[PDB]
Amino acid sequence: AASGSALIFDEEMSRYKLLWTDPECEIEVPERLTVSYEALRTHGLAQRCKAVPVRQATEQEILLAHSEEYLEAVKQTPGMNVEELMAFSKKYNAVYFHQNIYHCAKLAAGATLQLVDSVMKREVRNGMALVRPPGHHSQRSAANGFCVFNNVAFAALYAKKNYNLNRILIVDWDVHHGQGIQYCFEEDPSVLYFSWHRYEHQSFWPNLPESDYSSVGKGKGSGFNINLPWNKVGMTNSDYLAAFFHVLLPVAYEFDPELVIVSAGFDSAIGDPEGEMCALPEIFAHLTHLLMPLAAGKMCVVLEGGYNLTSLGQSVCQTVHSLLGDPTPRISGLGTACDSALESIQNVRNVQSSYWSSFKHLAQDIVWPEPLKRMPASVRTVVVPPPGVELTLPKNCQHSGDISESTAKEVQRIRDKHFLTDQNILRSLGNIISVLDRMMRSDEVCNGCVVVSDLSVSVQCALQHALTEPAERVLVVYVGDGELPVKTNDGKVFLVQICTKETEDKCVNRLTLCLREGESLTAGFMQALLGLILPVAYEFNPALVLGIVEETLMRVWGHMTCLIQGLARGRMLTLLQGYDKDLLELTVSALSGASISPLGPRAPKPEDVEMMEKQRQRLQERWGLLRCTVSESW
Ligand SMILES: CN1CCc2c(c3ccccc3n2Cc2ccc(C(=O)NO)cc2)C1
Ligand SMILES: [K+]
Ligand SMILES: [K+]
Ligand SMILES: [Zn+2]
Secondary structure (H helix, E strand, C coil), X not given: CCCCEEEECCHHHHCCCCCCCCCCHHHCCCHHHHHHHHHHHHCCCHHHCEECCCCCCCHHHHCCCCCHHHHHHHCCHHHCXXXXXXXXXXXXXXXXCCCCHXXXXXXXXXXXXXXXXXXXXXXXXXEEECCCCXXXXXXXXXXXXXXXXXXXXXXXXXXXXXXXXCCEEEEECCCCCCHHHHHHHCCCCCEEEEEEEECCCCCCCCCCHHXXXXXXXXXXXXXXXXXXXXXXXXXXXXXXXXXXXXXXXXXXXXXXXXXXXXXXXXXXXXXXXXCCCCECCCHHHHHHHHHCCHHHHCEEXXXXXXXXXXXXXXHHHHHHHHHXXXXXXXXXXXXXCCHHHHHHHHHHHHHHCCCCHHHCCCCCCCCCCCCCCCCCCCEEEEEECCCCCCCCCCCCEXXXXXXXXXXXXXXXXXXXXXXXXXXXXXXXXXXXXXXXXXXXXXXXXXXXXXXXXXXXXXXXXXXXXXXXXXXXXXXXXXXXXXXXXXXXXXXXXXXEEEECCXXXXXXXXXXXXXXXXXXXXXXXXXXXXXXXXXXXXHHHCCCEEEEEECCCCCCCHHHHHHHHCCCXXXXXXXXXXXXXXXXXXXXXHHHCCCCCCCCCCCXXXXXXXXXXXXXXXXXXXXXXXXXXXXXXXX
16 A cells, blocks of 8 residues: 655746736746745655656647647747747736746646656655646636646546546635636536635636536536635635535545545635635645545645745645644634635535535635644554454554553552452553553654453543543544443533434533434445534544444444544544454554545435434534534524
């Protein structure tokens, strides 16, 4: 199974620039590339990436997306002087040409193709191409919006042709609409395009009626084009995450792509003079992480825009950090999306409900704090199997049954206070405390898994010891039907429970998911995970995640374990009751950052969707990130 992240970059793509006065275009500068690579170098990220050389896209490759007439016209620009270059530029909208830009456009496109080959040949897990010029506005026969050739559209056509892929997801999180990509694939159900973009009721460039939520694709492609217009500026982390939980991810996990390509424009970040949005660079760590379980992690990130040199470097590092598997930053202050965003979300969900049934509803001078440091743990995952069980661990895991004397005193302290004598339980309690101490009190260990015999005693000591680490908030995720010694009456704990017996939920610090039996159970769980569990978990913002499985589904445990590591900087402790060799290896693999096997194809039972929406109604006034409609004003 592949490992590593590719980083594709060449200084040659910084060797063209605007040659005449034009305040509109003067933000597209060589320094965008130099600042981003240097930021990656400064933070040690470029050094941990496999450098793959750029190459030129061939004529044949360019003709996958562009016409002979347009290519021939661009091919003449290297011979043009400044007067001729300006006249050629003015044949198009919002684009400038330079003696070297045709060369650089072939490099930008070839760089993308190199990234596609590195990932699809399993030479790396994923990667990023830092390229100029950007691509997503260019069209079959036109340059547009600083773009000459459509790098990302190339990548998907090339992956289709050379790897016979049937399903490709393109995520365009640039702040502008990538109309060139939309047009390229609008009739094509094999490529799913998602774009959010500043729109402001069509008053924002490119001013197109077909950038609205009502453009769903054409013909056999209907439903495979998803536009989310932002009709106000100032969108925040919460708006962006609401878009992912309630629009992009539900569709993406049902689509089940074989490759993911990101049109990664960071002009959607705070401080950008084009986007004027308010999302922090740290949000791109989570946008990346939330897509990484798709396609067994095969993700090709391609730079589009981003014009605030500072938010640019920081957002590039946060993305590469997540591609490398480094722990995600905690996102504080999350809540409801704003009314305009909720309107956009509700509108796209409604027009798309004919194609993704999951969307059906039943009738009625800028500054921000510098991002903290993200550092992979010395050893990522600690595993404590039952005594005398030696297993083959991934290279970033480790055993740890070695209870210290400090720990041993604490276990007796606890034993004599609250409980009796089973020296096996008492050893596991020493393991829980030692693992928790390494997880919280050091950057030495990220997360862990402990196999456990007596649940009630083990949960109590894990939870109670976690609180005094200190862990100000603890998310508990429990697969089982019991009642745990967990109190949710002070706001320090949120309890997620997936069980078989329907049990009424009172207060708003608990989410109980009772899903019916059958082959429908897998999709229902995923829909609950993306639509309920993650919105609450993210708003709750825990400092530790505590997973609990009773010996008495679980085709999704790897997906939950991966996605839930977006919380608490990836600090998750899982207690498995009883030894199950496969569930233990699955848990360890997801905790350790390995790729997740895709889920493939059966839609959820209407009783399950009713139960989940009943839970959203019950919880969304407390937890506003659950909302996917505008609230009714009294
Ligand atoms: C300011 N409005 C929005 C942008 C714009 C407009 C415009 C008008 C004339 C020339 C260039 C222009 N530009 C330049 C422009 C800036 C950024 C991007 C971009 O990042 N696309 O992903 C693409 C184009 C209109
Ligand atoms: K976009
Ligand atoms: K499409
Ligand atoms: Zn842009």
